[PDB]
Amino acid sequence: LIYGHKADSLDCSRFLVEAPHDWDLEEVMNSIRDCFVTESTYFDDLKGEMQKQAQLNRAEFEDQDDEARVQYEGFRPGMYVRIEIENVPCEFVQNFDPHYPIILGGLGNSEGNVGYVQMRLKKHRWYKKILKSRDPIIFSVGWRRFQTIPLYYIEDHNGRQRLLKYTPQHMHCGAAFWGPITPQGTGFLAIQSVSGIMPDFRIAATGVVLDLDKSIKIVKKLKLTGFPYKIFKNTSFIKGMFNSALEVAKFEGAVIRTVSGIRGQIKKALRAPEGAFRASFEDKLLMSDIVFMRTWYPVSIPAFYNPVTSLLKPVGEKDTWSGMRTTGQL
Amino acid sequence: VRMARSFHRTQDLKTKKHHIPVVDRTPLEPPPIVVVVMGPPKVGKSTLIQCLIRNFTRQKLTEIRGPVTIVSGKKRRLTIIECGCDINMMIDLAKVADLVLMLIDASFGFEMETFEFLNICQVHGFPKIMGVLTHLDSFKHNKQLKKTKKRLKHRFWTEVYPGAKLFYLSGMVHGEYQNQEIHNLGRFITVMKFRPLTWQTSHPYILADRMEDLTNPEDIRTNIKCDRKVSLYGYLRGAHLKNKSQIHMPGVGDFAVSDISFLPDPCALPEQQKKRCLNEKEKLVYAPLSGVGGVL
Amino acid sequence: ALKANPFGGASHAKGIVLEKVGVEAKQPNSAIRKCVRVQLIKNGKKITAFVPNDGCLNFIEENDEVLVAGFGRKGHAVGDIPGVRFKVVKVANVSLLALYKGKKERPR
Amino acid sequence: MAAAFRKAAKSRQREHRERSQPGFRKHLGLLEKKKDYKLRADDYRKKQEYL
């Protein structure tokens, strides 16, 4: 009945009573009568529970036939099986080489989707060069092999993630990129180029996958620079940071400072040049000083995902696979 | 005092036993163990495969291609595959391998490919590893041979867990290794036990033994570039597989399985009996891409 | 008093890392930051363990298996914090010192 | 082994370097840092306390 008008109806998870009992006669009351009341360590107990579940899993569907068992629990490990795959590219069959193994990995829930993946990354100790941010790199994660463009970022104690130009030489570093969904806690490996042979070590970096999300939330530090032109003890007049009186109105009260380390405050715009303003400071400034204000600007990453298709190559050139080149190669 | 020492010794022994408990999901009848053979390009990878096969089956094999499935003992079967120097293929096998046989040239020493594969194994889940070093016949049974054995062993124990066996192959009689060393090597493979890896337990996977093209032949003549329906056979490993699911084939792309159906097991285990040794009937070789006897 | 000590008479103990209380709070003390919470396997007790140096926190992630040893002396070395009685020695049966120096790689 | 961790970290002794004045403002003088301004700041504080 389950596995062998109604639409536009109320969505209530309530069981309506088709035929209620009288509940006045004793005989109906009688049917409900019985329903009412008239030294091991923690490691040993946890093992004892797990062993109980282990037997129950094995001894459940034994009675049913194998065709029945396939319906309830799927194809179990250890059964020789035949799979039909449709829409295989023609280049696969024509260029098939028996030496190269063919592997079929079942995908979990949502693993077909793509999203933003955050990883904890460390450059390998034996690799000569370092990895530059915003350059193509090939990852081996889960079952897949693909080339993407990552962003390398470092965490701060308050929780901000600021962009890094390069991977640090001997420290862990965050990595963010756009790619397939992969369960957390898995290892990943990075190479620069699969094609060709290199005398040196080819494994670039190693780490673990941390987070799955749809927003990167990474920021980059931006400093706007100004120069004094008139000095009145603490108060000094600054030019060169802004270029309109509308602009200065946006940034009133912002904290600014010099190279020397004197902290200051934006006070009010000036009219005599286009974009100057009045700013007070802790102490008197010199003409040589340069003032700047620290602001954070969010960044973004291009969505580029290039899976490797080494098997879809002629028998002679399965080694030579090429993709986007890095900045140095260009 | 002595009972206090005995008490403290037992507690330290218990500490090694402690680990996170987990449900035991191993199959009642496990599939054949996957054994990969790798090394530097000209170390002797394919020679070792033939010696291992001749040790167990007495069947003639020529032009070995793809995985080879044989019966090795009453309760264990092996699947044998060779791994080349290609970086792409080296990565794929590390995901699926259950046993790794690493080949080392004793005269030359360590090479890059030996260390690269070990790092890949640590990333994707470390399988059981036994190192086999060859070319020991060049030395002259002197201090030089004695120290080379010790020097290569100590450097090897840092890559893997301590106590991982290192096997020695003395020399070649007539282009084949001596029968005694191969027999001792086969005993170690027989008696290993394997830990459950996180990735391999979570996801079902198949190492396909045979490939077959299933299309209408008139469609190919019409357009040779047409998308083709292809059927694959293999042993199911890891976890259960549903009828309609998404599968990823590395090096090709993502696909969804159209139909799934099981077949009677080839190279199956014997029905239990108390004969001392397996007769020629029980020793079976399944190699659909390799060619058994003379036919390829 | 044969089983008096929290390790149950053993020299070390094994636990599962529950969370990093020090990192989760945003105090940049570096004496708070090196406190982790682990649950001993043998008896299930929850304790707070110390990481020898900041930057070894990177090698540890959630739900790992660690080996915990006592902190006998030099408790005053850390800056003004009580309860410094435990320290993390191994993760995945690999020493923290070996991992930091780049002598070994953690096996997954 | 707290000191052992410290010794390994301090193996590299390259220290962060200082930036100079930009060229197009060279005639103004040297870009003062915290070490230089502190000399000028303590000088003022001594005289104002004396007056």
Binding site: R125, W126, D200 | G109, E111, F115 | - | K7
Partner: peptide, 20 residues
């Protein structure tokens, strides 16, 4: 065509303090 290991890989000295 053989890729022999470098000196750094052979002796994984790592981060060891430099001494006179």
């Amino acid at each position: 065509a053989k890729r022999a290991i470098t000196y750094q890989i052979a002796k994984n000295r790592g981060l060891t303090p430099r001494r006179k």
